[PDB]
Write an enzyme that holds these catalytic residues in place. Structure first.
Site, PDB file in Angstrom:
ATOM      1  N   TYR A  86     -40.758  29.264 -63.951  1.00 37.75           N
ATOM      2  CA  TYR A  86     -40.016  29.212 -62.556  1.00 37.75           C
ATOM      3  C   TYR A  86     -39.166  30.247 -62.049  1.00 37.75           C
ATOM      4  O   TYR A  86     -38.947  31.213 -62.680  1.00 37.75           O
ATOM      5  CB  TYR A  86     -38.790  28.251 -63.269  1.00 37.75           C
ATOM      6  CG  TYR A  86     -37.797  28.340 -62.281  1.00 37.75           C
ATOM      7  CD1 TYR A  86     -37.626  26.895 -60.834  1.00 37.75           C
ATOM      8  CD2 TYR A  86     -36.253  28.985 -61.966  1.00 37.75           C
ATOM      9  CE1 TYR A  86     -36.517  27.239 -60.128  1.00 37.75           C
ATOM     10  CE2 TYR A  86     -35.228  28.952 -60.914  1.00 37.75           C
ATOM     11  CZ  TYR A  86     -35.995  27.286 -59.979  1.00 37.75           C
ATOM     12  OH  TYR A  86     -34.700  27.724 -58.431  1.00 37.75           O
ATOM     13  N   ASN A 233     -28.716  35.163 -58.152  1.00 36.74           N
ATOM     14  CA  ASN A 233     -28.445  33.738 -58.797  1.00 36.74           C
ATOM     15  C   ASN A 233     -26.877  34.154 -59.143  1.00 36.74           C
ATOM     16  O   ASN A 233     -27.502  33.515 -60.911  1.00 36.74           O
ATOM     17  CB  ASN A 233     -30.406  33.901 -59.677  1.00 36.74           C
ATOM     18  CG  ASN A 233     -29.840  31.872 -59.700  1.00 36.74           C
ATOM     19  OD1 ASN A 233     -30.550  31.531 -61.069  1.00 36.74           O
ATOM     20  ND2 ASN A 233     -28.923  30.789 -59.113  1.00 36.74           N
ATOM     21  N   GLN A 313      28.102  28.829 -63.400  1.00 33.08           N
ATOM     22  CA  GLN A 313      27.089  28.989 -63.136  1.00 33.08           C
ATOM     23  C   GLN A 313      26.477  29.188 -61.933  1.00 33.08           C
ATOM     24  O   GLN A 313      27.110  28.594 -61.197  1.00 33.08           O
ATOM     25  CB  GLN A 313      26.109  27.743 -64.439  1.00 33.08           C
ATOM     26  CG  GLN A 313      26.438  26.120 -64.034  1.00 33.08           C
ATOM     27  CD  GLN A 313      25.807  25.147 -64.857  1.00 33.08           C
ATOM     28  OE1 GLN A 313      25.215  25.179 -65.737  1.00 33.08           O
ATOM     29  NE2 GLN A 313      26.007  23.970 -64.175  1.00 33.08           N
ATOM     30  N   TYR A 316      20.033  27.103 -58.449  1.00 33.68           N
ATOM     31  CA  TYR A 316      18.425  27.172 -59.667  1.00 33.68           C
ATOM     32  C   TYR A 316      18.288  28.307 -59.480  1.00 33.68           C
ATOM     33  O   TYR A 316      17.211  28.505 -59.607  1.00 33.68           O
ATOM     34  CB  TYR A 316      18.270  25.623 -59.069  1.00 33.68           C
ATOM     35  CG  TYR A 316      18.693  24.392 -59.421  1.00 33.68           C
ATOM     36  CD1 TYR A 316      20.055  24.617 -60.493  1.00 33.68           C
ATOM     37  CD2 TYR A 316      17.625  23.414 -59.795  1.00 33.68           C
ATOM     38  CE1 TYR A 316      20.544  23.413 -60.923  1.00 33.68           C
ATOM     39  CE2 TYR A 316      17.963  22.173 -60.489  1.00 33.68           C
ATOM     40  CZ  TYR A 316      19.314  22.261 -61.531  1.00 33.68           C
ATOM     41  OH  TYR A 316      20.137  20.876 -61.395  1.00 33.68           O
ATOM     42  N   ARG A 319      19.413  30.649 -61.850  1.00 35.42           N
ATOM     43  CA  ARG A 319      19.901  30.252 -63.304  1.00 35.42           C
ATOM     44  C   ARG A 319      18.686  29.466 -63.528  1.00 35.42           C
ATOM     45  O   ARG A 319      18.849  30.353 -65.145  1.00 35.42           O
ATOM     46  CB  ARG A 319      20.657  28.781 -63.279  1.00 35.42           C
ATOM     47  CG  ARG A 319      21.226  28.675 -64.157  1.00 35.42           C
ATOM     48  CD  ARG A 319      22.318  27.372 -64.666  1.00 35.42           C
ATOM     49  NE  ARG A 319      23.094  27.332 -63.600  1.00 35.42           N
ATOM     50  CZ  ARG A 319      23.058  25.854 -63.332  1.00 35.42           C
ATOM     51  NH1 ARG A 319      22.571  24.855 -64.021  1.00 35.42           N
ATOM     52  NH2 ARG A 319      23.658  25.317 -62.176  1.00 35.42           N
ATOM     53  N   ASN A 349     -30.241  32.936 -64.378  1.00 35.53           N
ATOM     54  CA  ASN A 349     -31.173  31.810 -64.129  1.00 35.53           C
ATOM     55  C   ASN A 349     -32.828  32.204 -63.762  1.00 35.53           C
ATOM     56  O   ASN A 349     -32.936  32.296 -63.148  1.00 35.53           O
ATOM     57  CB  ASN A 349     -30.633  30.383 -64.122  1.00 35.53           C
ATOM     58  CG  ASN A 349     -31.439  29.067 -64.774  1.00 35.53           C
ATOM     59  OD1 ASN A 349     -31.381  28.563 -65.436  1.00 35.53           O
ATOM     60  ND2 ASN A 349     -31.681  28.226 -63.794  1.00 35.53           N
ATOM     61  N   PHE A 365     -25.418  29.556 -63.164  1.00 35.93           N
ATOM     62  CA  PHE A 365     -24.933  30.447 -62.216  1.00 35.93           C
ATOM     63  C   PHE A 365     -23.541  28.877 -61.813  1.00 35.93           C
ATOM     64  O   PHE A 365     -23.237  29.626 -60.510  1.00 35.93           O
ATOM     65  CB  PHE A 365     -25.815  29.842 -61.076  1.00 35.93           C
ATOM     66  CG  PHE A 365     -26.971  28.928 -61.291  1.00 35.93           C
ATOM     67  CD1 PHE A 365     -25.956  27.796 -60.704  1.00 35.93           C
ATOM     68  CD2 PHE A 365     -28.039  28.862 -61.944  1.00 35.93           C
ATOM     69  CE1 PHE A 365     -27.092  26.996 -61.113  1.00 35.93           C
ATOM     70  CE2 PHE A 365     -28.741  27.947 -62.175  1.00 35.93           C
ATOM     71  CZ  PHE A 365     -27.885  26.541 -61.837  1.00 35.93           C
ATOM     72  N   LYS A 421      18.614  37.518 -40.264  1.00 34.28           N
ATOM     73  CA  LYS A 421      18.597  36.222 -39.784  1.00 34.28           C
ATOM     74  C   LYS A 421      16.804  36.179 -39.161  1.00 34.28           C
ATOM     75  O   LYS A 421      16.167  35.292 -39.439  1.00 34.28           O
ATOM     76  CB  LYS A 421      19.055  35.934 -38.788  1.00 34.28           C
ATOM     77  CG  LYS A 421      18.853  34.406 -37.908  1.00 34.28           C
ATOM     78  CD  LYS A 421      19.804  34.621 -37.247  1.00 34.28           C
ATOM     79  CE  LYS A 421      21.820  34.122 -37.451  1.00 34.28           C
ATOM     80  NZ  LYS A 421      21.573  33.211 -38.530  1.00 34.28           N
ATOM     81  N   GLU A 449     -27.983  20.598 -51.359  1.00 35.12           N
ATOM     82  CA  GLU A 449     -29.617  21.375 -51.414  1.00 35.12           C
ATOM     83  C   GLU A 449     -30.349  20.687 -51.491  1.00 35.12           C
ATOM     84  O   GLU A 449     -30.633  20.077 -53.233  1.00 35.12           O
ATOM     85  CB  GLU A 449     -29.753  22.950 -52.076  1.00 35.12           C
ATOM     86  CG  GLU A 449     -31.096  23.317 -52.164  1.00 35.12           C
ATOM     87  CD  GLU A 449     -31.390  24.137 -53.498  1.00 35.12           C
ATOM     88  OE1 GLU A 449     -30.563  24.129 -54.510  1.00 35.12           O
ATOM     89  OE2 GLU A 449     -32.771  23.379 -53.022  1.00 35.12           O
ATOM     90  N   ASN A 452     -30.414  19.009 -54.746  1.00 38.01           N
ATOM     91  CA  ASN A 452     -30.350  19.178 -56.493  1.00 38.01           C
ATOM     92  C   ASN A 452     -28.995  19.654 -56.614  1.00 38.01           C
ATOM     93  O   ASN A 452     -28.748  19.818 -58.052  1.00 38.01           O
ATOM     94  CB  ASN A 452     -31.480  20.800 -55.864  1.00 38.01           C
ATOM     95  CG  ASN A 452     -31.313  20.861 -57.027  1.00 38.01           C
ATOM     96  OD1 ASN A 452     -31.819  20.957 -59.286  1.00 38.01           O
ATOM     97  ND2 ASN A 452     -31.999  22.000 -57.542  1.00 38.01           N
TER      98      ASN A 452
HETATM   99  C1  LIG Z   1     -30.725  25.658 -57.268  1.00 41.40           C
HETATM  100  C2  LIG Z   1     -31.520  27.601 -56.940  1.00 41.40           C
HETATM  101  C3  LIG Z   1     -31.759  28.352 -55.899  1.00 41.40           C
HETATM  102  C4  LIG Z   1     -31.684  27.956 -54.608  1.00 41.40           C
HETATM  103  C5  LIG Z   1     -32.507  28.532 -53.430  1.00 41.40           C
HETATM  104  C6  LIG Z   1     -32.711  29.411 -54.097  1.00 41.40           C
HETATM  105  C7  LIG Z   1     -32.648  30.330 -55.067  1.00 41.40           C
HETATM  106  C8  LIG Z   1     -31.960  29.585 -56.420  1.00 41.40           C
HETATM  107  C9  LIG Z   1     -31.075  28.590 -58.231  1.00 41.40           C
HETATM  108  N1  LIG Z   1     -29.778  28.413 -58.651  1.00 41.40           N
HETATM  109  P1  LIG Z   1     -31.444  27.374 -60.280  1.00 41.40           P
HETATM  110  O1  LIG Z   1     -30.759  26.304 -60.069  1.00 41.40           O
HETATM  111  O2  LIG Z   1     -31.078  28.525 -61.068  1.00 41.40           O
HETATM  112  O3  LIG Z   1     -32.866  26.579 -60.047  1.00 41.40           O
END
Ligand SMILES: C=C(c1ccccc1)[C@@H](N)P(=O)(O)O
Ligand SMILES: C=C(c1ccccc1)[C@@H](N)P(=O)(O)O
EC number: 4.3.1.24
Lengths: 674, 674
Positions: A86, A233, A313, A316, A319, A349, A365, A421, A449, A452
């Site tokens: 990834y 990231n 006293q 507030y 005191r 990540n 992240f 004043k 996004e 996601n």
């Molecule tokens: C979703 C993600 C992403 C979005 C755009 C560009 C690069 C990464 C990362 N935060 P990840 O969840 O690490 O895949």
């Protein structure tokens, strides 16, 4: 023993908040910030963040080099073995099903499409360069732990940019926490055509010029697989700014504790409200520390000690100030720990675990610690400012400030001096805007996004609003602190003129009252002792002011009890009134004016008691080192002109030393219960 | 001329807000609400919504029957021709790709899966039955316009449920605006096994029992194609409740205008603040009407007229009240028009246009007018309550209420009577919670239903929060109004006792002061005229209270100017002081107590001037019709016991008549500029 690390977290919350602040200040002023991925403090981030020539330098721990190389090498070897990784051979985010073998082009493309921010003309849509430095420092700190798979050379290049104060231009907005703004750091490093940087004096630089002035040799970096993603990231921008905000919030919380005590001093408040029994019986440590700090100031107050040798006293805002400030300090302290863990986290990540020969996919992240701590801290800032607004309002209201002039007016003629004043109306505007700012950011999460990112922290947006709140708290603190110094000087004027009135009333009494009217001199002086100077001193012999009326009332009450002696004009107290009143009218106005003129020249008959107070360093700093002037309608100077001096000094951190000096003899414990 | 209907919308905003309210009240009290799909007012929805035996009945316009049949027949004929219709032969929402020929089973399934709310035990998660009635009325009004394709018989059945006060149980939450709660109306109509209803006295009914008590013959309905969707696909619940909230908000805005004037009356405010020139020069019609209404009350005030026959300006809560209330009234009025259009809209989908032989797909279910108007109205309610909190605070503070007792204490002994101090703390709690409620709902939109509903109005959630705000405004209005009536009675006590003091001071003066001290009787009476009764009347001859002190000061000042006549005891004014003071001490306390006792018995020497005031109907209603009692520490009755009387009466609408009567001689114009 502690397998989830709750216990080590608890350890960091021991000891006083003040000692924590003292350490922060000492850390801030160190000349070198050595990063090793694990010891970053908010004070170091604040120190690096400054662009004011403190000379602080960043250096990278050579101890991290081996772990950094191992994961970099691991990723490159993975690329050569054809494996599917990834962010290395796959697309990003919701589009991660796409595949490619052009690892270099993939990272180049990553930075290109993340450069989606907008600057416009001018600076309104640009991340402050101090915040960009903070984010650079924090990103290095993440990548140094060896889990990210990026070359050490790139970290060294960012270090040179920091140590030469060459700063890439980042967009203000575009992040839900920090891909887009972090991509503008990577774009400088790759020399993107739109990439810009600012030099130390503010000149815009091309990537070429920036590399040149930073002494980065070897030309622009060509990102290797995963390197673009490691740069972008992370939560560095949100947590970077949160550190800067928290550094100042911690110091301002101590300023609020101390100013609450100076407030008590000038209000002639009852120091009983800081009694340790009261606060011990609630267990809250923030409130116990706050009470003890104010107790310390009051136990070394010449005002309190003077009152001892001579309403049960307070309201507030005085005191209940320890009860009020206590929880805000606990929130600020707990938020600080959360941010310090975040700036030392591996927020990246995926993570490259060379020890297990694999990448670990996860969500580090996700900047929730930033959003949550900044939201909570912003509410606490608002509560500190609301208390400060209440205190200020009490101080300038003659209904509640125990004899101080309305508006803390300074001049001889209250009809041409309305004091604070305007400043008081501005304090309301500060407080109101602060209560608006107190609303949370992190309850406005959009599913982002292509869904996601269906939860996201909004950390940096929250940090930005807490930073605004902190600035407003500085406007309030400046305005309050100059008000307190004015009141200090008004107590100085008050005690000197009161002595003059009492000497004049006595001397005229001992003359024109010799027959049996000798007995009422003690009562006449008591009229002076108990009457508020500022209720009459602008016109002391006016027949409609309380001094003449009550002196005359005293003579009348003595005549009524004078019996048959009152029937002989030779021994009639009533027959002495007009002589007394004429004699006082002839002598008292000039005696008062002379003593006042002597005070303005630095020759007071009675020295300013602030000089024997533990709070003296703040007054001395404001009034003498900064030259902040006593405010009077008899001069042209505006309150704002004097506010400027303190505000600019506060923003340069010059309040820190006098603030800490007022507490330097405190042993960190409350007084014994006496 | 007006092809987008802006002009007809503008027409509805002409004429005064007060005449609009008068019409609303008359409409509310009509015995029949005839629905024809086009003339529904918030007052009719409020009238139907009540479950308090007013006897109001709903009847359906026979004129709508033909259009209703035409679209019902059209849908059935479409079903028989095999055509593919959304919500008739297709699935719903994001799942509309599914297809079916079992039209009846499709609508049965629709109601089943929309029954997704939660009630629990008790009533906390149940929509108030008044709101459910409002939603039933409003749903009928949508379906009557003939575009929905549902049988008229079903509308008649809902009408019977309304006219017999048989109400299906709806869940409180579950809607982003109103499929889920509206499905519980359809479930009653289809006799779903979980469906429940409440009878008029509160007994839970089965669908069978409910049909029986409502006189709905023919058994449960089996929904025909599209009929389930027509029942559920509307904004009836949000707009139903918004109508109920707006009906009360409109009346409370008039109460706020009038109470601002009674406030001015008892504060001895300067009626100049209502001068038409001031408000004419700002053009805002809400502020101009507000000023003119208060001007009307003040121009018929016996207090003002009394002051005329005998500080230049007031604090903001009094002087700026027209500027403050004006825009809130414009918001409430504009929001009312928006809701009245919504309750008369065809909020359904799809729409059956028989005239073009087709269904029109659209978004009329999108309740944005509800969300927007309720959010805006809630902010205006909070602003009305903040002003009311400021006014109340002024009224009970002796620093600012022009001689009224601190706390509006009522009894003879201020040390055992703290008046409205508890009520004042409760007013702060009301105001604070109101400012929280002022935050918007409609900025919290989630992308819903597999992102098909990626914007949604949240209308009903907003209506629910505005309803809560209205209740709090009622708690504040109740508390304020009882405070105003107390102050009225305190001015009555004040003028009677002041007359007694002046008569006693004069009579003792004319006795013991005959020699030349005869001249100072005019000055001694002036002391009484200018001194605040409540600064001394609890102990009128106390030597530390201002009356004795200033009387004695007067005698002393006359003796000092008495010259050589002062030297002969026969003509010495000073020699008369102790005789005068003894004589007054002997007679004044009992004269004062006697006059007070005579007032408490209904025999005042001077009648209560409220009786000659245009504001008299509200005082008379509160004090005499409701029996709300003057509050005193000399009795056991609490302020809350008296608040209850007004609050319960206010919630039954009994404040409306005295409120309107105080203005019934107003011609709707401001006074000429004089
Ligand atoms: C979703 C993600 C992403 C979005 C755009 C560009 C690069 C990464 C990362 N935060 P990840 O969840 O690490 O895949
Ligand atoms: C989306 C909708 C829906 C959702 C669940 C059940 C029934 C309908 C309708 N508001 P529509 O947009 O008219 O299709």
């Amino acid at each position: 023993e502690d397998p989830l690390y709750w216990g080590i977290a608890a350890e960091a919350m021991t000891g006083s908040h003040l000692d924590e602040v003292k350490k922060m200040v000492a850390e801030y002023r160190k000349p070198v910030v050595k990063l090793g991925g694990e010891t970053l403090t908010i004070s170091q981030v604040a120190a690096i963040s400054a662009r004011d020539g403190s000379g602080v330098t960043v250096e990278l721990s050579e101890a991290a080099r081996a772990g950094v190389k191992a994961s970099s090498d691991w990723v490159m070897d993975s690329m050569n073995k054809g494996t599917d990784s990834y962010g290395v051979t796959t697309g990003f985010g919701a589009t991660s099903h796409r595949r490619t073998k052009q690892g270099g082009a993939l990272q180049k493309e990553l930075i290109r499409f993340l450069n989606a921010g907008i600057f416009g003309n001018g600076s309104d849509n640009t991340l402050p360069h101090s915040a960009t430095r903070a984010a650079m420092l924090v990103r290095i700190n993440t990548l140094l732990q060896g889990y990210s798979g990026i070359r050490f050379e790139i970290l060294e290049a960012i270090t040179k940019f920091l140590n030469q104060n060459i700063t890439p231009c980042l967009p203000l907005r575009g992040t839900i926490t920090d891909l887009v703004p972090l991509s503008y750091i990577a774009g400088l490093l790759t020399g993107r055509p739109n990439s810009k940087a600012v030099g130390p004096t503010g000149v815009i630089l091309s990537p070429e010029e920036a590399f040149k002035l930073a002494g980065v040799e070897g030309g622009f970096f060509e990102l290797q697989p995963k390197e673009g993603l490691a740069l972008v990231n992370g939560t560095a921008v949100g947590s970077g700014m949160a550190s800067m905000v928290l550094f100042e919030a911690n110091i301002l919380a101590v300023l609020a504790e101390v100013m609450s005590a100076i407030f008590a001093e000038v209000m002639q408040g009852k120091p009983e409200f800081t009694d340790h029994l009261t606060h011990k019986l609630k267990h809250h440590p923030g409130q116990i520390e706050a009470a003890a700090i104010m107790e310390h100031i009051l136990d070394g107050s010449a005002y309190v000690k003077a009152a001892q040798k001579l309403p049960k006293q307070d309201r507030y805002a005085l005191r209940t100030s320890p009860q009020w400030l206590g929880p805000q300090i606990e929130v600020i302290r707990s938020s600080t720990k959360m941010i310090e863990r975040e700036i030392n986290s591996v927020n990246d990540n995926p993570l490259i675990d060379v020890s297990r020969n694999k990448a670990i996919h996860g969500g580090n992240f996700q900047g929730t610690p930033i959003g949550v701590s900044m939201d909570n801290t912003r509410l606490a800032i608002a509560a500190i400012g609301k208390l400060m607004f209440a205190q200020f309002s009490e101080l300038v209201n003659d209904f509640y400030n125990n004899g101080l002039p309305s508006n803390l007016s300074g001049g001889r003629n209250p009809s041409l001096d309305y004091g604070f004043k305007g400043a008081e109306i501005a304090m309301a505007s500060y407080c109101s805007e602060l209560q608006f700012l107190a609303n949370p950011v992190t309850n406005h999460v959009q599913s982002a996004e292509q869904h996601n990112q269906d939860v996201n922290s909004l950390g940096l947006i929250s940090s930005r609003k807490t930073s605004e709140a902190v600035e407003i708290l500085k406007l309030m603190s400046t305005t309050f602190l100059v008000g307190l110094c004015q009141a200090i000087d008004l107590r100085h004027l008050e005690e000197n003129l009161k002595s003059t009135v009492k000497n004049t009333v006595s001397s005229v009494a001992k003359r024109v009252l010799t027959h049996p009217s000798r007995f009422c001199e003690k009562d006449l002086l008591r009229v002076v002792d108990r009457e508020y100077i500022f209720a009459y001193i602008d016109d002391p012999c006016s027949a409609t002011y309380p001094l003449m009326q009550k002196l005359r009332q005293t003579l009348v009450e003595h005549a009524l009890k004078n019996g048959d002696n009152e029937r002989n004009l030779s021994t009639s107290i009533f027959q002495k009134i007009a002589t007394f009143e004429d004699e006082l009218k002839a002598l008292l106005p000039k005696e008062v004016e002379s003593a006042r003129a002597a005070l303005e020249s630095g020759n007071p008959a009675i020295p300013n008691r602030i000089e024997e107070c533990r709070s003296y360093p703040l007054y001395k700093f404001v009034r003498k080192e900064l030259g902040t002037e006593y405010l009077t309608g008899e001069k042209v100077t505006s309150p704002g002109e004097e506010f400027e001096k303190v505000f600019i000094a506060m923003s340069k951190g010059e309040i820190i030393d006098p603030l800490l000096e007022s507490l330097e003899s405190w042993n960190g414990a409350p007084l014994p219960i006496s």
